[PDB]
Amino acid sequence: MQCNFANSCTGVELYGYILRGDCINEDGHPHATSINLNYYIGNDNGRLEYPGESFGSSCVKTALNDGHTLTASCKGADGQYHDSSMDLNYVVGNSYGYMEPCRASNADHVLKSSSE
Numbered sequence: 411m412q413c414n415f416a417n418s419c420t421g422v423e424l425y426g427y428i429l430r431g432d433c434i435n436e437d438g439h440p441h442a443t444s445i446n447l448n449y450y451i452g453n454d455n456g457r458l459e460y461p462g463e464s465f466g467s468s469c470v471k472t473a474l475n476d477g478h479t480l481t482a483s484c485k486g487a488d489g490q491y492h493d494s495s496m497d498l499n500y501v502v503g504n505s506y507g508y509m510e511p512c513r514a515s516n517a518d519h520v521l522k523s524s525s526e
Contacts, residue, residue: 413503413512414478422477427466429474429498435507445509447472451496452522453484458496461513462522474498 415433416422420440422431427448432440452462453469458480466472469484471493478499485491502511515521 412500412514413510414499415502415504415511416476416478416499418504419477422474424472424474424480427472429480429502431477433504433507433509437507439507441507443507443509445502445511447480447498447502450501450511450513451480451498453482453486454522456484456487456490456492457494458482458484459522460496460501461516 419431419433422429427446428444429447430442430444433443435441448464448466450461451465452459453465458465465484468486469482472480472482475481475495479495479497481495483491483493500514504510
């Protein structure tokens with residue numbers, strides 16, 4: 411099952427940390443909705459982690475590949491950045507043409523390895 415927003419979402423764009431596109435609702439018509447990945451994705455070891463927070467704050471080159479995978483370069487691995495990607499397929503989904511980023515993880519609390 412998963413989420414897979416892309417299954418019913420078309421024309422997806424990404425600017426900084428904003429994913430916008432036309433997702434079909436129960437009516438069967440594509441509804442324009444936008445999501446802020448910055449509040450749903452994190453950056454662990456300079457990599458894109460499914461569910462996180464404020465990744466864009468330390469990530470650049472934010473783009474969407476094939477309208478399902480997010481790509482960006484983040485710092486954390488060792489005081490250096492690294493180009494990474496994240497399958498949003500299990501971190502965001504379409505629900506009645508409404509932004510519904512359903513993550514399949516987000517355990518404990520600060521899985522972004524952030525003590526402070």
